[model samples]
Target chain A: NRPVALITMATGYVGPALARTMADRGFDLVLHGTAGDGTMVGVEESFDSQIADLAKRGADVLTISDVDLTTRTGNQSMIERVLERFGRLDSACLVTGLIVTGKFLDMTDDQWAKVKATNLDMVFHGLQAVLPPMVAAGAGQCVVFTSATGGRPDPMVSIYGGTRAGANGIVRAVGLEHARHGVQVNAIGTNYMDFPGFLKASRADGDPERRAMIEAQVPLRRLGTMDELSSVTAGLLDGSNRFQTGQFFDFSGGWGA
Target chain B: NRPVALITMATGYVGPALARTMADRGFDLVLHGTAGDGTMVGVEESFDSQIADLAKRGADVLTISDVDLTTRTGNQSMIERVLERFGRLDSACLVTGLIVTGKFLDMTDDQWAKVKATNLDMVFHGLQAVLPPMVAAGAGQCVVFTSATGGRPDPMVSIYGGTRAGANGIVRAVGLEHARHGVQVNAIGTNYMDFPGFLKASRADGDPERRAMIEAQVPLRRLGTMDELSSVTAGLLDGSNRFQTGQFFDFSGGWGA
Candidate 1:
């Protein structure tokens, strides 16, 4: 069997693009996501189409959905399904989090709860689920998506960034803890990217002028493309450079550097 | 005025080697250490000779000694002197920590206090001191020396590794918090390194057979040299790569990956 690459939240964001590239790189894939842009609502057609696309690219694709990634059982089942389908996991890119951004003073108890559940718990459980097979093989790679703000949480982004920082720490500890086992685990935290969530959140979705203004905040003076991010993320997962682990790479065009 | 690079603990370890290279790469120097071997007691001659050699390499050298780095005031004084002597700070390499090892069960309160003071407080106070000059300049780089064990922190290395991990976390947060200012803060964690402290701790000193046994543990099958580490460290501070910040790089011959 070809090495398997598992990508969680594969219906949207970096998942679809990452899956295409991973498949092209000669790995079968395990993709997990939900209906409607990998969120709560949307037609399942998008996900089915994504699976078809991967299959067309010469990959044996395993699609998983309707699993609560924020829970241990959901994450464990996701990994189990990957093992049953491919019998091995070589790489995993876990896109976990639900962004809750606003003034810290205005953040509600409910908001905090949601943030912890979506951001922190998912990462904890997801890593626990993904790590065993890799450790057993004594070789594997993993990337967890954290926010660039996690590197530097500011006033308005207090809770979200704080949670991200915690996640980044967990990734670092775990990445290092498994390094002796030859399993590389790292985190990529991104901000000011060319994505729907970011576009709408920054209020630059429809206005080029506003977009440019937002871009100015980044030292690179532009938004990062998903393709660019996917390429960087793939480098860590692709087994070329093995010297790095237990680290976080900021992908916000020096905005988080 | 030439850009100044400040090196803490220059009397022994990577500081002397790093200072020489940084001067060769066109940085004036600020070297700090104690009376002997960069620890509690040693003759000032070695540090002075290091200063003369850097001066010979055309670096205007400013030397500091007898200052406690584990306190805010001590670190503040060090940075103040750097600014006073050179009027600008471009890069800083803070070598922080004192190693304590053995089973976690046998640990004492004093050991924990010493570990926290040496590994964590120095980083906290040191960064707080060094960052202002860099942030004010809107461009500077810093590398904090953490231990590779901080990443994995196996059973034998409890307090020291934990504190180093905490320091790494601090570096990530502080590095990102100041990125927009063009100042970069990063951590380098090293293990299985060819140094006196490491050699003595690993019990590989003065015995080639023992050393070989230790060497077999690293995937690279050898110890990392100070010169090799200095070159890597200089790259971050030399303005060669500004894209990376708020990250930890493991330099452990793949032991920490």
Candidate 2:
């Protein structure tokens, strides 16, 4: 009688943190990821190897390999597999949005296309696929991982921010649209998280001292941990918190505020 | 020889107020409004009659009827009409939004479709229509009237808010996208306005008791007047302010803030 959790971005981002917390809470995981194409950093392990580590709490771990989430068919396929394998999806944590940094003039047509695909495509498809099952069940929860930029997609990061904001918008509508069915979908737009992604972007690894400069920009004066971010994320996905929906919470150390 | 002001929504909401103020500022007005037959408040006023009242400052007025803003051709036709009649487009104020409210689950495919059609379609087409002329001029100001819900389209107001936020996101990207072109595109979203719309919704018009209760909910402790809202709106459209774009301002008396 275990509930199934569809955790997107399992290969990277905060998939492991969510898996740990969610598994403890009794959710079989359907982790969606890049399937490790040997291109991503810290992605040397095999799928079965990763799945074994994730099965620590006796929860079954299933992986969707070789799928591009930025395509409609890709997202559609993931949800279809979740249904085929587990028969029902009780929770989802989507982290498929993309953001590219740089000035507006320098933003290429290529950059714009890629950003929309990465940020908007999966969202459009994933939500369409996830909600139908949830709405049919009349009870479900979903959390979309966006970025703090969507709150105020800043100067150089316009297109990326804009598309992220678009994702947040869709979440708002979909969350509220499905809320009456006892389904809740919300968004968390986070940055400066203590992850390889943020560390790499901030260039905080090489100098070590650069971490302090970046941390100082945030009022809390530190990067957020995967634990800290995942806790907030899991809180929404775990069904313990149901009062909030159609909302986009800023998780960027209040910097977006 | 008046520089043209394309005042969308001239028949209701901010259109009349913006038209009066912008026309008083000595710009010839290409006032765009619902061209439907026989049923719009303030739309009933003959153009000559409107001109008579608006002529308090010797401003000329023109009205375009029978055009649907929800389509590209319609919006394009309006702009083409503006160009043919006025020769130059220096400023624009567009009321490109509509709101639908209800329980989220009760929301139907029809509801979602209608909301997007009314709320987002006009913005997409209208902006595409208005921007070309402004971009051509290289020095122009354009304002899109969205909703403060755009800032946070919370429960019940989901689809509308999501789409509104999408509009704002587009504004952010496009506004900054064309910043180098010297064309400013901005969005303003308002709720709890001191108007028939908000009053009837809140049942505050005849009941001072309910009005006070509603006002207390706002940080400013009052509903915002069209005068107050329009003045802030005009600042962006009238060219007095130039340093901002790719931004969405909240005019809900701190309710949205």
Candidate 3:
């Protein structure tokens, strides 16, 4: 059987784009996302359409929804399903965090808790589940998706950025911890990313006026395309490379640097 | 009150050095540490000795070891005490966290909890306590001590680095959030420092051979001095400059770079 890789949040963000690139590289895919009524939010395709696109690129795909990724059981069961069907887990890119930003003092208890549960909990649980099989096999690759704000965490995004930084930290320790076991884990954080999720937040995609303002803030004078993000992301997940781990790479076009 | 400045963990690490420099910078000092006969680990100097040292620099000093800094009440009460004794909180270099290390999977539940408590909780509470008065004054400077590991978080030091990263994230967000109000918050993290802490952990103090090997790991081929850390830290807290906030500075002899 071909090697299997898991991609979380497959319906949005980098899900569809990453699914395509990895599939082109000969990965049999397992995609995890929410099950919706086949409506598209930011991109032009639905989840079903995305899966079909992946299959066309030569990936045998297994899609799972309804998994509670914030809990150990949910992640464990999700991995168990992957193993049961594919017989092994070679790689995974777990997308995490809820972007909540505002004035630091005006932040409520609810906002703080939500970001932690979304950003911190998801990374914690997802890694706990994905690493075991890789360790057992003496090989695997993983990336926990955080955000570029974790690098600088500018005003209004403190709590969310803080949690993301924590997630990157865990990636470092765990990545180093498991390197001897031949497993690799890293974190990819980005901002000014061109995706439905980011577009919705930035209000940049449809409005040329807003897009230009946002682009001007980045050193590259551009928002990073999903294609750009996926190319960097798939490098960590593809498993042929094994030289780096326990590192956080920012793909915000030098905005963080 | 000579414009109060607070330094935590007054007996060790950057604490004592920071107190002296801030004192020299013409600020009254509020020092936090473990209160007792100095039997506690990491608690090597009596609080009075620190105050005496600061007095030599012509700065008034207030010492508090009775407050619980790990809890919200502790930090809040400590800040309250600083205000009670000194009448204002102008600047602070809050030395925070306890470090733990291990393989991620091999890490115990207890270890995980301890790291989180030390790294994330301490920072959360410490910043929460320190920032409000600074915000009210519309001008303040604060730096939280994290670690260079928070920059890269190599294997084995995952959890600690991770939590430290989280703390830095908080600093960034809070720094920027309050920047508009003229309050600046930032983080300073270092590794391979020539301190009791680094020597004991790396076992380089007695072994010239081991020390050389450790030095090789740093790009600068040396360990950082507490004086060096303190000098950089004092610049942030002295309130003479105010261009940066919500930034994480790495001072590991260029190792993090």
Candidate 4:
């Protein structure tokens, strides 16, 4: 039987592409999304259509929507649902987060708290919810996402970068903690993706100075595609060979180096 | 004129020993301690009586007591006092910390909060308070203390180790951030020290399993002395090199490797 992969935040811009890529590779899928019920209805309907397409191509597709994983109970329930449907979880990709843009001094407590909850606390909760079952089975792959801002101090986005730093440390600590148990945990630190936030932010001022400034710093001189990130993510999780663990892979166009 | 070195937590068991060592090397000294006024009087009297006995020989000694550095105001005041006494700050060593031992599930909120404040927050405040002046002077060294527990998980001291992990990250980040500015920051990750905590904990249990287990893991085959830690600390701050930053000097007796 093909191994199953459970991906959170499956309705985001990067999520569906990752889901489709995994489906194309013939792995069983459990894609999760957490928009409101109204938003999830449309998302689930679209995903159902895609599942039909994958089913025709001999891929097993399963998806859950409207699950708020920020809360412990919600995360536990989502994990239970995935396990019930798939009977096994071979890999997990946690990619649920929000980007709040602002100066550090002007950022409100609520803004900081919300970003912390979505980006850092949610990852901790997901690890707590999923690791027990993974440990019981004695084999799994876990990947957490960080960003280029995390490796350095970005004054404009200090709070956001702080949250990513906390998440990055969590991956490092837990990766070492559980490496002896046949479960591998790692992280990916990347630059901006072609997502909605970048799209809106890049065009907001219309002067393009900010865009040009950031682009000049990137060695590749272009934003990375979802396909590139997805391919690397899949390769890490595909169990081709299992010598690597407790490692962080960077996709920041050599910005950190 | 010889450069001045400020040592925080200077009344602790390791602090005075380090002070004597630095004095022997011809560095002037300013020491701060949290042990109230009475202890400060005793320390100053002893320093005056034994000045000629010190290896560094006839160094200027400035001792301040009754200062709690767990707050920003206290940290700032301590730095200000050091500047006033020496007219310039050259280097600093931060060694104030509390070790609260317990299982993670049973650890108290107060225990966690206080240790984090004392151990992690103090380092952050120390670096922030001292780095600006050191940069203005165009040269400086910072030596921060962490533990082997930061690199690996130890169930018995997770809270303490967790805070050290935070300290380790801050040290790495600050070192990388300030490398170009002629400031070098590094940390000493020591194993079980021959301090009061080790003596008390080791005697509390008649079984030597805990101590033996850790010692066996170290290639050096023993707990480290204050002299060993102090020598390494002195070497890093000895003004001999300028190219090292953003690196961890593991003194864990080869345990980390």
| Candidate lDDT values, in order | 0.83, 0.78, 0.84, 0.69
Best by lDDT, which number? 3
Per-prediction share of native contacts kept:
0.16, 0.40, 0.92, 0.01
Q: Enumerate the chain B TM-scores of all models.
A: 0.95, 0.93, 0.96, 0.87
Q: What is the lDDT of residue B144 in candidate 4?
A: 80
Report per-candidate DockQ: 0.10, 0.27, 0.61, 0.12
lDDT of candidate model 3 versus the reference: 0.84
**Alpha-carbon deviation at A131 in model 2, angstroms:** 7.1
Residue B145 of model 4 has an lDDT of 74
- Which digits, one per residue and each the tens of the lDDT, describe model 3 over residues B215-255? 99999999888889899999999987799988899999888
iRMS, all models: 5.4, 3.5, 1.4, 4.6
| lDDT digits (tens) for residues A129-157 of candidate 4 | 77777778888888877665655534455
Predicted candidate 1, C-alpha RMSD: 9.9
Models ranked on lDDT:
3, 1, 2, 4
DockQ of 2: 0.27
Give one digit per residue, the lDDT tens place, for model 1 in B110-219: 99999999999999999999999888988999999999988888888988888888999999888878887888888999888887767877788898999999988876
The local lDDT score (0 to 100) that residue B130 gets in candidate 3 is 89
Task: Provide the lDDT at A109 for model 1.
Answer: 98
Q: After superposition, how far is residue B176 of candidate 1 from its true place, in Å?
A: 1.5
